[PDB]
Amino acid sequence: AINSVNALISRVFVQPKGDLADRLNSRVTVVILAVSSALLLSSHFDPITCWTPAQFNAQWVNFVNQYCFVHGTYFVPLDQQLAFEEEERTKVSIQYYQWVPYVFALQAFLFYIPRFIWKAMIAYSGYDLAAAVKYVDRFWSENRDKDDKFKTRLAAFEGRPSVYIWDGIRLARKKRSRNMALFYTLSTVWQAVNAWIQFYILTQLLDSSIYTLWGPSILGDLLQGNDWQTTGHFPRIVHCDFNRRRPASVQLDTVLCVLTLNIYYEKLFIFLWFWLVFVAVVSTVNCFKWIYYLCNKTKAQKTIKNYLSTAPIKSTISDDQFFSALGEDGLFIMDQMALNLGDIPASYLTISMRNICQDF
Amino acid sequence: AINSVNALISRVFVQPKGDLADRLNSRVTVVILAVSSALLLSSHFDPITCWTPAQFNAQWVNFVNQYCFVHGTYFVPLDQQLAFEEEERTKVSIQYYQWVPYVFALQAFLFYIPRFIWKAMIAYSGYDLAAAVKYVDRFWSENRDKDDKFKTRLAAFEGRPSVYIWDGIRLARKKRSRNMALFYTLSTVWQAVNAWIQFYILTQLLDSSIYTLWGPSILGDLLQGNDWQTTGHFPRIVHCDFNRRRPASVQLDTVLCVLTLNIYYEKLFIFLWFWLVFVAVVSTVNCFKWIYYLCNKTKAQKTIKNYLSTAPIKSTISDDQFFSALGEDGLFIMDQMALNLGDIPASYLTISMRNICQDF
Amino acid sequence: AINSVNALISRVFVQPKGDLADRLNSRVTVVILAVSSALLLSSHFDPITCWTPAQFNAQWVNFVNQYCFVHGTYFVPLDQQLAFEEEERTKVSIQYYQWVPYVFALQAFLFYIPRFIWKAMIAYSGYDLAAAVKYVDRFWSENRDKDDKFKTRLAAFEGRPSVYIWDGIRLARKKRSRNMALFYTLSTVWQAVNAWIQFYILTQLLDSSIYTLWGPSILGDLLQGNDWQTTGHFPRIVHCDFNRRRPASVQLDTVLCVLTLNIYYEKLFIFLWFWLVFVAVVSTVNCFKWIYYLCNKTKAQKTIKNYLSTAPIKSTISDDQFFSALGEDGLFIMDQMALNLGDIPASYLTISMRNICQDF
Amino acid sequence: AINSVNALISRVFVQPKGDLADRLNSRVTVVILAVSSALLLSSHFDPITCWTPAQFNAQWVNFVNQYCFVHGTYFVPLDQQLAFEEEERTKVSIQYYQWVPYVFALQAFLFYIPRFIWKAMIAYSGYDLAAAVKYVDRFWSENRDKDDKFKTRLAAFEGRPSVYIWDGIRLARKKRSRNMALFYTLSTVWQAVNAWIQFYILTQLLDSSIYTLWGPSILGDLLQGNDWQTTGHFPRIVHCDFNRRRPASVQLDTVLCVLTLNIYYEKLFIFLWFWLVFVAVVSTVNCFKWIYYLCNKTKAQKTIKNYLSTAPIKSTISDDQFFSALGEDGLFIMDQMALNLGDIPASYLTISMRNICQDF
Amino acid sequence: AINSVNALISRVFVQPKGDLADRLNSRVTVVILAVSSALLLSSHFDPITCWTPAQFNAQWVNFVNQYCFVHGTYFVPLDQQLAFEEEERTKVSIQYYQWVPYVFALQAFLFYIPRFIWKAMIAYSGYDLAAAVKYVDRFWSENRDKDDKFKTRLAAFEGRPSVYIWDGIRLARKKRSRNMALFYTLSTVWQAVNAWIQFYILTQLLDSSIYTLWGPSILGDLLQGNDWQTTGHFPRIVHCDFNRRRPASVQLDTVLCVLTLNIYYEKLFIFLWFWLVFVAVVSTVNCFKWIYYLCNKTKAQKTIKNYLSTAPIKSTISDDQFFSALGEDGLFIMDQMALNLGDIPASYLTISMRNICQDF
């Protein structure tokens, strides 16, 4: 069949509000893994077809098909006979159907967790960003328009938003955060780990009994023209095993099945592998970034200090103290706002706050 | 087939108005259990397929299929013959089809009850929150916008909303609540119990005649590579039993059926198990939280007292009395509002109410 | 079947905002390759049909069809017998099904990368264009309307937008760009390479074991009336190979299959080939363009200097210094704005900025 | 089946903005050729049916059908036997299936190119019309309404739009166009050629080995009652050729197929032929028109000069100089505007521009 | 099946703007012929069914059905045997399937041409009506509303629209029309011819070899109870002819087919015939109308002169001269406006124009 659902994509793909760089890779991740997870268990709506000899009446075929699909399957390169017992026949054993389609659902779930962690934790801090972001935001969106406030613009920031935030610090700083930075950087480590664990669940997918994969090995095989059966691995054609019961007991036999899926799974696994391990490496640099921010922190002030390097007319107040009274949570939320609302406005914001900060 | 219904999700998933933390897990719960409950009895629209010998004309196959699906089924690892009588054959007996799809409907229903309890009970108290929440809410939403009220903002709260609530206390406090807190904390205990009972209904699902499950045992089996039949448990292939009637009486026989569902049910039961018992443990801490709030209550005042720790200019009125006249219902609804409307505004609210409170 | 999806087209096809010339060929590219990539693996929803002799019961036909489709196929012109062994039979070997449908997905992905590169990199520069573009943009859209500002128009630019940008340079020029031009021209080289690599992946598609293609050779064959089999190449009718297993081991045979797809693939490959290699040559001239801009750069100033060649009344300020203090990032963003917003307005912009530039 | 898509039609059929006479025939062309191109490869969703003798089991019929459809077909009038070898049998050879459905896609593409050429080239000139057209346009649309400007109308044009254009000439005329006319007339020649080439691709469709067609010959045959087979040409019933392989090698035979399509293709080819060659002849007169405009050019001024033949009160300024300073690009864009916006307004425009033109 | 498309009807059926009497019969025509043209080639989605003797395996039936449908068919009243050769058998020969469904498409096309002619030609005149119609139109629509202009209404017309038109005459009358009337009346003759030609293409449909039809003959037969076969004409049951090829050459035979369509075609042909020849006779009177307008023309002035027969207060200006300076194009466009906008307003228009006409 053919079907396409846009609104389900647009919903999470956009509606949760943040631009946060390369953390949106958690989003786009969850999308890819979610979709492919589904479309695979879609059964291409012919999961697997099999060969059965000719006297079965076709209501056995529609059986032996399933029975093959559930009870295990395996492979042999072809012409070895089968030998006997279980040993040489079942050595090379491929069933991942018990794994792929669901383990991806689990995947996407574990890429969407860390956000939920974040919102929960930042809610623990008692000081919400999201409210602030929207508030100062549509502030800027609207008043930006009007001609009136440009030369007045600075004082406008001085009155309306700047005090709002600063109060936010008043109420908040009493309750359980100077520490929000550390909460955050926890969320970024936790993120990076989660990614890695995912990667390792790929390589340990298939099974640690029968080898494992990583991309340019496999490609560098395919590109060597090693096909599949003559790799000995990634089979497209298998020999299924099957049973009956009569007064003679086990009564078993083999029927060789064509295998369609295996063309998919080892079409994508390459791609999905590149793309994950990418998501790891890009998601770790952002992880240590906030430690290298958190330990040093004397050169953290840079950008903020740098905003006071434009500083029209430079009225009075010194900084080092001013940074001191502000040291923790503000220093962060500033970076956040500058990130969402962009560069130019947040300058206006800070240069306001320094000015009106007096009693604190 | 393929079908997806968004509006049914968005409806309860959002439209009932509250942000209440981790109580929305009752919501998302009801979603998951509801959906899976349905999609399972969807019959993947091939419930179970069976093997029958070859002279049945295919209008018996479409019978013996059902008949197998209703009358019991069972399992044996394979090669034991069957022995005889009923004993060794029917020992290992798996039918949960009579349970899963409906018992989940019951599940979701019992996660949605406790809300209905709450709204009913809080309606018994005679003092509604929801009205207040919306009222003070869109108050803040609108007037927040306008530039006019900032330096005036405080007095604005003083007039419009603050009196409104306070009157709410006037009418209410005459009728059947100082006690609303205790009502609430009942609802949270009741909640936690309900969750637990649900868990136990999982472990007691399947049946207390044949073992029971809990997750990392099962996984820690699968990850041991114990497959299913060689676990002896969670079978994917069964031996169905069947009857006719002729002048010779019982006239019975066996036909081995493939079983598709059992790949689902023991794909999800793991996940659903983690996720429930999670929902329990996160829903209990919130349960005792309101006892540790309700017994102590002298350090309950903390946050509220803490709001009067900003307190511009601190005009006159003392607190301890002021908390005394307010002791019960207000002390709560304050926390509620601060929870929904966020931190900064509710401060404005309280610091108003203290001020205008005179005659009471 | 018949189905057509517009919104998926319009979405990326338009919604990402830029008019950038002939870089939108990356867009339209991604469209074509995306669509054809899909519609081919649509299986014209009869992938391939085969001939099998007459005693197969039709549940083998529905097998041998697939089995042919996965295990390799090949061609021979017809009447050579088959000879024997593997040599003369399998010499002329055509299976690209393992390639085309997916390798196109990869294609489109690699044409959409370079944008993502660009937005990421220009975000590294800390100075965003997009904000500016929209801002100055709807500036012009709205105020253009009103009659009031025409004779006043110039001063209007002087106040509202011009200062806005200039500040943008203030904040930005402190942080990590004078260099944005070089970033950009990297993105254009990278672009051109990517295109070329794509072309070469075409010619190396099929396989470097069996010849390769380029368009007017093939056409210039077809137009010679060389058909296909009597080209010896691009076969429409193949001889599939097939196996069983009995006590006699390999037990193999051949069945000649009709091949429908090959009429598609060698209907389009021509077209797609022209259109790619086009996209290369048009995308390289634009590549060196920004080097010939970046090295010289003394005649880069031309257009900008040329705007100050209209210059009402020519108040005072000299240029060469004025260009000097502006040298890098501005010089570019000017070209950008003139590109998006068109010619006439950006003149107004620059001629404003020169005027108000004083302290810097 | 039955399906109809309007929005795809309306989209290009309207949304690209211009009224340009008889150049919209490029548009309506692309429509017709596009649609018929598709609906033909729709396979009337029975491409061709064939006769095969009676022992084929119907999974060969569904083969020999295709195999006939790909490997060539041919015709003989009926009763000649077949003779032998390949000569007299395959002389009269009709397969155009390898051509029609795709070569039309190519067609429509080549009628849509010349626009893209135009927009690209006119963008090279640096002076955009489209902006101007919309601008002056909705100018006229809105202010036309208001009663205020009628007696004032002239001066209104004097201020708002007229200066806007004139500035457009200031910025533009510095950069790479006095020449836009020649660019344009190139686009019209190029257009006319493209059309002709299309025609010739019709007549050379079918093949230059077996005759060729032009309409009133064919009709003038049909209207003579020459049917088809007794034309010897345009067959509706063919004798397909077919192969097997057994130990005896080529093993070939013939099966006569009914042919449905050929009723379509030679139903439309007539119509499509008239309509193309029309589009040529109407598109050439417009081609030389702009040479007869470009060489003479002294009588080009006519219309424009004629507008200054109404000229309220005729203040001062002479013309011949005035045309001289305006000579090139303006002279054109005037004609354009008068074409889109109609006759009456553009008069107002010019008669404004003459007046305010002073310094230039 | 069942399907109904409204928007395709409403689109041309309304959206092209004019009320022009009985010229809209060109519109409704194009509708009827278009629809029936389509629904007939819809194949009632069983085109024709045939009788074949009993040993054909049903994949010949699905052949001989088509083959009958393409190669000719014929009729005989029944019991004549067949005689022999081709003479007495094939004398009475009915195949119009090669004609009806497409020749109707051609029909509708030729009823829609004359409009396109008109718009093209009236565009040649350089003076557009449509603009005027819309302009003066929504003039009247809006200002009609307002109470203010009633006693002032006349002067309102005097200022706003009336001058607008008159200017239209200024610009236009310089360029290539006093003659627009003659252009128009050409379009009406051309119209009438086209209609007639259509009629004659009906009567010459079927074929001029076998009789021809006109309505009340046929009806006056049916109403005589002449049925069909015992008319000898309009057969519902035919004897199809058919071939094979074996070593014995032509090998031909006959199979009698039921014929469903012929119940349709000779259900509608009656109706469609009445309705066409109607459209002719009503479309000719309107044709000569504009000659009897164009030659006389002294009594053409009637209506216009008659408007100046109400003429409040009759200020000064004479008419005969006034008509003289206006003689041609205006005299027409007046009739047009009065036709679209109705009677009462256009009076206001003319009585304005006479008044303000001075210098001309």
Tab-separated table of N, CA and C in Angstrom, chain A residues 3 8 45 59-60 62-63 66-67 70-71 98-99 102 126 135 138 142 160 164 167-168 170-171 174-176 242 244-245 247 249-250, chain B residues 2 44 49-54 58 79 81-82 144-145 150 228 236-237 239 256 258 263-264 267 302 306-307 309-310 343-344 347-348:
chain	number	residue	atom	x	y	z
A	3	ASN	N	0.874	5.099	2.091
A	3	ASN	CA	0.280	6.021	3.053
A	3	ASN	C	1.375	6.930	3.599
A	8	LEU	N	1.727	13.835	12.273
A	8	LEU	CA	2.481	13.130	13.297
A	8	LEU	C	3.945	13.547	13.270
A	45	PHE	N	3.443	-4.022	4.081
A	45	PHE	CA	2.043	-3.974	3.701
A	45	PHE	C	1.758	-2.655	3.003
A	59	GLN	N	-3.135	-24.765	2.416
A	59	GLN	CA	-3.338	-24.341	3.785
A	59	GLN	C	-2.260	-24.856	4.689
A	60	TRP	N	-1.389	-25.705	4.200
A	60	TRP	CA	-0.160	-25.871	4.932
A	60	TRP	C	0.862	-24.836	4.542
A	62	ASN	N	0.476	-21.710	3.890
A	62	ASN	CA	0.207	-20.577	4.750
A	62	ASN	C	0.481	-20.885	6.202
A	63	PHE	N	0.811	-22.113	6.516
A	63	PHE	CA	1.276	-22.452	7.851
A	63	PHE	C	2.791	-22.419	7.833
A	66	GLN	N	4.499	-19.155	8.247
A	66	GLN	CA	4.635	-18.674	9.615
A	66	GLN	C	5.596	-19.523	10.414
A	67	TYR	N	5.314	-20.817	10.527
A	67	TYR	CA	6.154	-21.647	11.374
A	67	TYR	C	7.613	-21.428	11.071
A	70	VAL	N	8.751	-18.158	12.763
A	70	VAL	CA	8.882	-18.023	14.207
A	70	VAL	C	9.985	-18.907	14.733
A	71	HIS	N	9.822	-20.207	14.600
A	71	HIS	CA	10.918	-21.089	14.929
A	71	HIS	C	12.123	-20.693	14.104
A	98	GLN	N	13.302	-11.513	15.992
A	98	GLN	CA	12.941	-11.358	17.389
A	98	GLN	C	13.499	-10.084	17.978
A	99	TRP	N	14.303	-9.345	17.225
A	99	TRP	CA	14.967	-8.177	17.775
A	99	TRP	C	14.589	-6.904	17.034
A	102	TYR	N	11.241	-4.328	17.352
A	102	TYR	CA	10.928	-3.788	18.661
A	102	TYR	C	12.100	-3.038	19.260
A	126	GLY	N	13.129	25.022	40.245
A	126	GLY	CA	12.156	26.015	40.621
A	126	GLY	C	12.114	27.227	39.726
A	135	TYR	N	8.366	34.986	27.107
A	135	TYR	CA	7.963	36.303	27.548
A	135	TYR	C	8.837	37.342	26.885
A	138	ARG	N	8.297	37.291	22.794
A	138	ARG	CA	7.292	38.064	22.088
A	138	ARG	C	7.340	39.519	22.488
A	142	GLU	N	7.207	41.891	19.211
A	142	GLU	CA	6.261	42.976	19.003
A	142	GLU	C	6.973	44.309	18.962
A	160	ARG	N	10.598	46.955	30.866
A	160	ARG	CA	9.622	45.874	30.859
A	160	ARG	C	10.207	44.501	31.161
A	164	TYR	N	11.575	42.000	34.945
A	164	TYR	CA	10.873	40.733	35.076
A	164	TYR	C	11.844	39.608	35.389
A	167	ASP	N	13.536	39.924	38.894
A	167	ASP	CA	12.660	39.374	39.907
A	167	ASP	C	12.710	37.862	39.882
A	168	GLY	N	12.672	37.274	38.688
A	168	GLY	CA	12.797	35.831	38.605
A	168	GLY	C	13.967	35.325	39.416
A	170	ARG	N	15.145	36.922	41.990
A	170	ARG	CA	14.834	37.126	43.404
A	170	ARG	C	14.102	35.931	43.978
A	171	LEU	N	12.963	35.583	43.390
A	171	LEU	CA	12.200	34.463	43.922
A	171	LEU	C	13.006	33.185	43.855
A	174	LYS	N	16.306	32.149	46.157
A	174	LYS	CA	16.031	31.688	47.510
A	174	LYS	C	15.841	30.185	47.561
A	175	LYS	N	15.338	29.582	46.489
A	175	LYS	CA	14.940	28.179	46.529
A	175	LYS	C	15.793	27.312	45.604
A	176	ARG	N	16.720	26.579	46.213
A	176	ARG	CA	17.370	25.371	45.701
A	176	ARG	C	18.065	25.527	44.355
A	242	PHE	N	11.844	-27.687	10.230
A	242	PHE	CA	10.421	-27.860	10.418
A	242	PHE	C	10.114	-29.223	11.012
A	244	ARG	N	6.897	-32.172	12.348
A	244	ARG	CA	5.552	-32.652	12.549
A	244	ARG	C	5.551	-33.520	13.789
A	245	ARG	N	4.392	-34.071	14.105
A	245	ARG	CA	4.319	-35.141	15.078
A	245	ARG	C	3.431	-36.241	14.552
A	247	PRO	N	3.144	-40.829	15.298
A	247	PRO	CA	3.690	-41.855	16.192
A	247	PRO	C	5.210	-41.968	16.156
A	249	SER	N	8.449	-39.793	16.226
A	249	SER	CA	8.311	-38.655	17.120
A	249	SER	C	8.668	-37.313	16.500
A	250	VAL	N	9.955	-37.014	16.354
A	250	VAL	CA	10.330	-35.647	16.021
A	250	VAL	C	9.938	-35.385	14.580
B	2	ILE	N	-3.643	-0.091	7.807
B	2	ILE	CA	-2.923	1.016	8.431
B	2	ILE	C	-3.924	2.123	8.733
B	44	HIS	N	-4.447	-7.855	14.653
B	44	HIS	CA	-3.508	-7.399	13.629
B	44	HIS	C	-4.223	-7.180	12.298
B	49	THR	N	-2.831	-19.915	13.735
B	49	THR	CA	-2.955	-20.781	12.583
B	49	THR	C	-2.718	-22.203	13.037
B	50	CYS	N	-3.365	-23.167	12.397
B	50	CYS	CA	-3.145	-24.516	12.861
B	50	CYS	C	-2.983	-25.451	11.675
B	51	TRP	N	-2.600	-26.684	11.983
B	51	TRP	CA	-1.893	-27.576	11.076
B	51	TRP	C	-2.753	-28.588	10.341
B	52	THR	N	-4.039	-28.581	10.521
B	52	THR	CA	-4.836	-29.792	10.389
B	52	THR	C	-4.530	-30.741	9.247
B	53	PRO	N	-4.658	-32.043	9.469
B	53	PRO	CA	-4.328	-32.999	8.420
B	53	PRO	C	-5.211	-32.799	7.213
B	54	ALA	N	-4.895	-33.541	6.167
B	54	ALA	CA	-5.066	-33.009	4.830
B	54	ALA	C	-6.439	-33.218	4.238
B	58	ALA	N	-11.333	-27.273	4.065
B	58	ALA	CA	-11.047	-25.852	4.257
B	58	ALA	C	-12.214	-25.076	4.837
B	79	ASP	N	10.505	-33.598	22.462
B	79	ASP	CA	10.061	-34.921	22.090
B	79	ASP	C	9.744	-35.615	23.406
B	81	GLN	N	6.636	-37.519	23.498
B	81	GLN	CA	5.322	-38.007	23.109
B	81	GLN	C	4.299	-37.145	23.834
B	82	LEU	N	3.108	-37.651	24.088
B	82	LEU	CA	2.151	-36.930	24.896
B	82	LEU	C	1.831	-37.596	26.218
B	144	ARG	N	-0.256	40.975	31.859
B	144	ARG	CA	1.189	40.843	31.710
B	144	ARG	C	1.686	41.623	30.509
B	145	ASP	N	1.019	41.439	29.377
B	145	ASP	CA	1.278	42.134	28.124
B	145	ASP	C	1.471	43.626	28.318
B	150	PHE	N	3.301	47.737	35.555
B	150	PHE	CA	4.510	47.085	36.023
B	150	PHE	C	4.880	47.653	37.372
B	228	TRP	N	12.685	-19.880	24.151
B	228	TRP	CA	11.382	-19.924	24.800
B	228	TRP	C	11.009	-21.344	25.203
B	236	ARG	N	6.060	-20.409	21.801
B	236	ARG	CA	5.558	-19.905	20.542
B	236	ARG	C	4.850	-20.942	19.689
B	237	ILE	N	4.873	-22.220	20.066
B	237	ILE	CA	4.297	-23.284	19.250
B	237	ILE	C	3.605	-24.290	20.143
B	239	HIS	N	0.327	-27.310	21.091
B	239	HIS	CA	-0.406	-28.468	20.599
B	239	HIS	C	-1.846	-28.336	21.020
B	256	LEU	N	-1.104	-29.414	16.072
B	256	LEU	CA	-0.187	-28.429	16.628
B	256	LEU	C	-0.332	-27.122	15.863
B	258	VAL	N	0.757	-23.058	15.162
B	258	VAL	CA	1.656	-21.949	15.331
B	258	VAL	C	0.931	-20.862	16.089
B	263	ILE	N	4.406	-13.833	20.239
B	263	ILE	CA	5.570	-13.002	20.008
B	263	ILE	C	5.291	-11.568	20.448
B	264	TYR	N	4.094	-11.040	20.190
B	264	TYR	CA	3.779	-9.723	20.727
B	264	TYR	C	3.843	-9.768	22.239
B	267	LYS	N	6.764	-9.705	23.663
B	267	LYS	CA	7.593	-8.544	23.404
B	267	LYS	C	7.242	-7.375	24.308
B	302	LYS	N	6.883	27.210	54.703
B	302	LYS	CA	8.165	27.700	54.249
B	302	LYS	C	8.002	28.553	53.007
B	306	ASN	N	8.390	32.313	52.583
B	306	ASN	CA	9.529	32.742	51.791
B	306	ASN	C	9.130	33.821	50.795
B	307	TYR	N	7.898	33.775	50.287
B	307	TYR	CA	7.436	34.844	49.407
B	307	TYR	C	7.396	36.176	50.119
B	309	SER	N	9.419	37.070	52.126
B	309	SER	CA	10.812	37.421	52.299
B	309	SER	C	11.342	38.322	51.190
B	310	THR	N	10.589	38.543	50.114
B	310	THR	CA	10.968	39.616	49.202
B	310	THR	C	10.274	40.916	49.596
B	343	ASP	N	6.052	30.494	39.113
B	343	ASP	CA	6.583	30.999	40.370
B	343	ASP	C	6.294	32.481	40.532
B	344	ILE	N	6.837	33.296	39.648
B	344	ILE	CA	6.834	34.733	39.880
B	344	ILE	C	5.445	35.305	40.179
B	347	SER	N	3.700	34.907	43.838
B	347	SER	CA	4.302	35.817	44.797
B	347	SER	C	3.525	37.113	44.843
B	348	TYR	N	3.370	37.739	43.685
B	348	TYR	CA	2.556	38.934	43.628
B	348	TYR	C	1.213	38.702	44.289
